[PDB]
Structure formats: structure tokens, C-alpha cells
Design a binder for this molecule. Structure first.
Ligand SMILES: CC1=N[C@@H]2[C@@H](O)[C@H](O)[C@@H](CO)O[C@@H]2S1
Ligand SMILES: [Ca+2]
Length: 642
């Protein structure tokens, strides 16, 4: 499965062998980055070059007349790799590398080019910025998948955002950035350095010069594309006239003055329809006043959304140019306890002409995001032929060949975001969703359930456990495994709980049932400890997994079978589904050093120093470290733990 799929492919159902002896025509005059790839890969004539080179004159009418276009031919007599331009030749080679299987090439002719001009990744999330090593890995991944754009803009980099956007990077970070630009250039990626000055920018000469001064420093490190972001700010930095004037100044005094600057992009304050005032002048001001070479970014009809024909028509009409899409998936920075490892879908596949670019905002988990990134690369290059599920499967097998089926199992049940303030959800566990939904309907109402449905759930829990143990021990992609490990532990526990809960449904005798029930309570407690010890970030601490379909099913099944046990044996077993050490009909929650009522008396499991209490029917009272176990009366106690 060539990824991205070429615009045009004719296959001959013959194969040849990579020539053991070959003649290379055009090596000294073709893109040096393309020649190095070809030489790594390896008489029969092999012709490599860009349109205009002597080496490729015979094929000049086969070469697509598109930026980043190429002609690739393999037959009995010869191999041709001909770009419309240097980047096209590199890309011919990336397709060539995928065709070569076990010293053998199929007989093929390809004519190819991208449908969207700018394709790639914006590292533009809140959270821990990617590591240097992660970024190096990403850049190489982008070259293989024909992504030409990497926008550097981590919200939490103090040299990118306020107030230290004014300061040059220190030497060590500066040397790192320089290395990234070198590696980007080698993989035919535009490194686009972004700045986020809007929260404390003064519209004066001092701050304008400081911004230009910073861009000059980045230029000296080798940066040749630049962005200015005005997202998620308030105050005087939201002024569109001043924003347009600053960007026009950067364009006129810097972008159009240097010998070799490429992209100049801006992200607006009104960056989606819901955040834009239909009766305000903001977007029209930018559209009218911004120099026509400046790109304007857009996230769709909401902060988190997929791109539709109508939504993009709306923005394009106002900004008077095709929108440069900032797509907010798989970014998880607002559901930080979830991994979003499902397929890329929901974006209109017929609107390439209406966009100047398409970039993905990924997770803080660099390797994990490669599933979506590979898929966005495929989509943006050939939207017409974009295949959601095949691409997801191809991504997984690329990322983890040694355990592709195991990663598919884990990813397929780690796709949804759960409820959230952005209203954005994805499908999860759809394969088993109907079996789950039947089983539980039947079971809850005392009608007999189908054996096949019970077996399906059983098979699922078994395969999850296998997948988890195998993924833990995988050494093919260590950085991926480090990223997901906490979720994998939680995924195994979920599967073990499901297995035990189903043995309870098969309920042999009272004694066996009680063993199973006690095993389940222990598993709940183990899940709570992971949720409190792993991924303890300030915003959505912990680890959630298989949340849309599997966890609800296991929970409701458990509560149901305990209710029936209590009726049959006149018993009083606790049917609660999440473990909670503190006692309070709403469920308590524990988040860091807070104990919380999910929106009279609370008894903690020990005496703690009390920090404060926040109630809300903004009530507040510090407890000055006063010992506290009981608390009688949002509703949030904070304690020293801490
Ligand atoms: C433009 C946008 N700027 C923000 C990004 O930095 C976040 O990562 C994203 C998800 O929370 O939300 C908005 S979209
Ligand atoms: Ca050339």
C-alpha cells in the first residue's frame, strides 16, 4: 500500500530485480538529498533528475507540471525517477523506496504530485514540548511521508510565548534548533519557527524591533520560514489592524528583503467560526489588509473540528484567500488522561482547492501521534483517494512492524476523548459495540443473552491481555512504548476485570462468585493506584482507557450481577464500580491532593493536614494545615499529600 497513494499508478503485473549492475545517469545534477537515498538503496540504466536536467530530457512530457510533482517508471530496460523540481525528485525516491520489496521492484509507471501545497505538523499544543530526540525522529518520518512543513510552536516554550519571546534562545537550545533545521532541510521539510507575542505585546517600536531581532537570530540558526500566532490571548494584542500592520512589516522589511525566505504564516485570534464575531470587523480587517502572500490559519467551525465544504467557504470568503488548516487531532492537551490512537476521519475529501495548507496539532506523546500524522500525510497529499482504515492499518504496521496486530488492538480501544468542554468525540470499539449492547440489554432485563456475544467479549478480553503484555516487552520502538506504558497497564487491568466479571455471570456456586467478586474489587483498587500514580499533570491527571464501550459494559455488568446475587442470596455486597478509599449518591473523586464531589459528610481514610475547601452553589476557607478526617456541611476539599 503506497502511502500516500499516487495520483496516477499503472501496474504491469511483472517484477524485475534491483540491478546488481547498473548505470546511473544524472547523479551529479539531481537533488543531492534524493541521490543519497537512491545510493543507500543500491548495466540497467537508472535515470534521476529534475525537469531541465540532461538525464531526464526523454521523459520531460511525462513529468507532472505541479510543484513537488514527479514521474517514476520501472520496466525491463530501465528505471526513471524525475521530479518537476528538486523536492519532487526526493519524493519520487520516497515512493521508490516503498516499491522495493526483497530486492525486487514491480513494473510500474507513476505520475504524482500533492493536492494540497503545504502539508505537515504544527507542534502547537499545551504541555511538555517534544524532546530533541523525538523531533529528530519526527523530521525523518515527515520526509518519508511527503510532509513539507513543520511548524515549531509549543505553548510552553518560554522563548516562543510571553514574556521571553523577546529573548534569544540560550546557547544549548540554539544549537539544538540549528541541528533541527539542518535535519529538516535534509528531509525536504520547511522548519517554520513561530512566535506567540500577543498576550503582552505593546504596539510600539521597542517591541516591533525586538520581534524582528528575534526573527534575525532564528535566521542565523538557518530558519527560513516564520509564523506569528495570536491564538488564545486577550487584551490589546487582539487588535486586527495592528496584527495586519505587524505582519505586513515583517513581510516588507524581512520576508521580502532576505535572499531565501519561504513561508510567512499567521494564526488569528478569531481562529474558528464559534470564536469569530459575525458582526465584528476582525476577520474582514485581516482579509483586506494582510499582504496576499501571508497565510492565515484556521481550525474550522469550532476550536476542535473537522473541515467541511461549507465551513471553509465561510472563512475563505472573509479572509479573501484559501485557509491554511490547523487540524486539532490527535492533540490531547485538554483530555490529558486519554490517548487518541484512532483513525483520521471526518474531513471533506473534495475541498483540496479551497485550502493552502493542512497541518495536524499532535499529542505531547510524539511517537504515539505518528498514527494520525502518517494518516494526515496521506490525506493531504491525495484526499480524493484517502482511505481511513487502510491508512490507519498501514501507519501501525509502519510504526511497529513486529507487533502491528497488538498495537491495532490497543489503538482500537483507545480512540475516544470522553466528554469534554470542546464537545469533540471519536468512535471507539465499534467492532464489539453491538455485541456489548445486546448482551447488556438482555442481561439487565432477565432475558437470555446469545452465547456468541458472551464468547466475543471473552475473546476480546483475552486478546487485550495478550496485546498488553507483548507491547510492554517490545523493543523495536522503545520511545513509543515508554509513552504508552501507563495506559497499557491500565488496559491489561481492564481486560482482567472483564474476564472476572464474565466468570461471575457464569456463576457456578456462591463460593466461586465470592472469589471472583473479591478479585474484581482488588483489580479496581489496582486501577485507582495507576490513576493516582501515573500521568499526574495539573489538568486531567491519570490514566483512562477503553472508556467509550468496554469500561461501561464491564461496570454495568458487574453492578447487575451483584444486584442479582444480593437478591438470590439475600446479601449486601457493594456494587460500586470505581474504587474510592474515602467515604461520602454522587461519586467522590480524587485528583492529585484534592477530594471532590462529582458535580453532607465526607470521611477521609486517614487524618490529613487540611489546605482549604472550595464549595460552589465562589465559597472558600483555608484550613491552615488543621488536621482533618471528617468534613460536614463544585465541592472540593484540598489536603496536604501533596
Ligand atoms: C489555534 C489554536 N490554538 C490552541 C492550541 O494551542 C491548542 O493546543 C488547541 C487544543 O487545546 O486549542 C487551540 S486551537
Ligand atoms: Ca537538477
Amino acid at each position: 500500500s503506497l502511502q500516500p497513494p499516487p495520483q496516477q499508478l499503472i501496474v504491469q503485473n511483472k517484477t524485475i530485480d534491483l540491478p546488481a549492475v547498473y548505470q546511473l545517469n544524472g547523479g551529479e545534477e539531481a537533488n543531492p538529498h534524493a541521490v543519497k537515498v537512491l545510493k543507500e538503496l543500491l548495466g540497467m540504466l537508472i535515470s534521476i533528475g529534475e525537469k531541465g536536467d540532461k538525464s531526464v530530457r526523454k521523459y520531460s512530457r511525462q513529468i507532472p507540471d505541479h510543484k513537488e510533482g514527479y514521474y517514476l517508471s520501472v520496466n525491463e530496460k530501465e528505471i526513471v525517477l524525475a521530479g518537476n523540481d528538486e523536492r519532487g525528485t526526493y519524493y519520487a525516491l520516497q515512493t521508490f523506496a516503498q516499491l522495493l520489496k526483497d530486492g525486487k521492484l514491480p513494473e510500474v509507471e507513476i505520475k504524482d504530485y500533492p493536492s494540497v501545497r503545504y502539508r505537515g505538523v504544527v507542534e502547537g499544543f499545551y504541555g511538555t514540548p517534544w524532546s530533541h530526540q523525538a523531533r529528530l525522529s519526527q523530521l525523518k518520518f515527515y520526509g518519508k511521508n511527503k510532509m513539507n512543513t513543520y511548524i515549531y510552536g509549543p505553548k510552553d516554550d518560554p522563548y516562543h510565548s510571553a514574556p521571553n519571546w523577546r529573548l534569544p534562545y540560550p546557547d544549548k537550545e540554539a544549537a539544538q534548533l540549528q541541528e533541527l533545521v539542518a535535519v529538516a532541510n535534509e528531509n525536504e521539510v520547511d522548519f517554520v519557527w513561530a512566535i506567540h507575542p500577543g498576550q503582552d505585546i505593546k504596539w510600539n517600536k521597542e517591541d516591533r524591533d525586538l520581534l524582528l531581532a528575534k526573527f534575525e537570530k532564528m535566521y542565523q540558526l538557518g530558519v527560513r520560514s516564520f509564523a506569528v500566532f495570536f491564538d488564545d490571548i486577550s487584551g490589546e494584542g487582539t487588535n486586527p489592524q495592528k496584527q495586519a500592520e505587524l505582519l505586513n512589516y515583517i513581510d516588507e522589511k524581512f520576508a521580502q528583503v532576505k535572499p531565501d525566505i519561504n513561508q510567512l504564516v499567521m494564526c488569528p485570534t478569531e481562529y474558528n467560526k464559534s470564536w469569530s464575531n459575525p458582526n465584528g470587523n476582525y476577520l474582514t480587517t485581516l482579509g483586506d489588509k494582510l499582504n496576499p502572500s501571508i497565510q492565515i490559519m484556521w481550525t474550522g467551525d469550532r476550536v476542535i473540528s473537522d473541515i467541511t465544504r461549507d465551513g471553509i467557504s465561510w472563512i475563505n470568503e472573509r479572509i479573501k484567500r484559501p485557509a491554511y488548516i490547523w487540524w486539532n487531532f490527535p492533540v490531547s492537551d485538554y483530555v490529558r488522561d486519554h490517548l487518541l490512537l484512532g483513525p483520521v476521519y471526518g474531513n471533506d475529501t473534495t475541498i483540496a482547492k479551497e485550502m493552502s495548507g493542512f497541518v495536524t496539532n499532535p499529542m505531547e506523546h510524539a511517537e504515539s501521534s505518528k498514527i494520525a500524522i502518517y494518516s494526515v500525510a496521506s490525506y493531504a497529499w491525495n484526499p480524493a483517494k484517502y482511505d481511513t482504515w487502510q491508512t490507519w492499518k498501514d501507519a501501525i504496521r509502519t510504526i511497529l512492524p513486529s507487533a502491528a496486530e497488538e498495537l491495532e488492538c490497543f489503538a482500537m480501544h483507545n480512540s475516544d476523548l470522553g466528554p469534554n468542554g470542546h464537545g469533540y468525540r471519536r468512535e471507539e470499539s465499534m467492532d464489539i459495540q453491538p455485541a456489548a449492547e445486546r448482551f447488556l440489554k438482555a442481561f439487565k432485563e432477565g432475558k437470555n443473552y446469545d452465547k456468541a456475544d458472551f464468547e466475543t467479549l471473552q475473546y476480546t478480553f483475552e486478546r487485550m491481555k495478550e496485546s498488553a503484555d507483548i507491547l510492554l516487552m517490545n523493543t523495536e520502538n522503545k520511545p513509543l512504548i515508554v509513552e504508552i506504558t501507563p495506559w497499557v497497564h491500565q488496559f491489561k487491568l481492564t481486560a482482567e476485570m472483564g474476564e472476572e466479571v464474565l466468570k461471575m455471570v457464569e456463576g457456578r456456586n456462591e463460593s466461586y462468585f465470592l472469589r471472583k467478586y473479591n478479585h474484581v474489587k482488588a483489580l479496581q483498587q489496582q486501577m485507582f493506584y495507576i490513576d493516582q500514580t501515573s500521568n499526574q499533570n495539573p489538568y486531567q491527571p491519570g490514566v483512562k482507557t477503553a472508556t467509550r464501550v468496554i469500561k461501561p459494559l464491564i461496570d454495568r455488568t458487574f453492578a447487575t450481577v451483584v444486584k442479582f446475587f444480593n437478591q438470590k442470596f439475600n446479601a449486601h455486597l457493594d456494587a460500586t464500580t470505581d474504587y474510592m478509599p474515602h467515604k461520602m449518591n454522587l461519586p467522590l473523586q480524587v485528583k492529585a491532593n484534592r477530594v471532590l464531589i462529582s458535580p453532607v459528610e465526607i470521611e477521609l481514610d486517614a487524618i490529613y493536614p487540611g489546605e482549604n475547601i472550595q464549595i460552589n452553589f465562589r465559597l472558600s476557607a483555608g484550613l491552615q494545615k488543621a488536621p482533618v478526617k471528617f468534613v460536614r456541611f463544585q465541592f472540593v476539599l484540598t489536603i496536604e499529600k501533596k
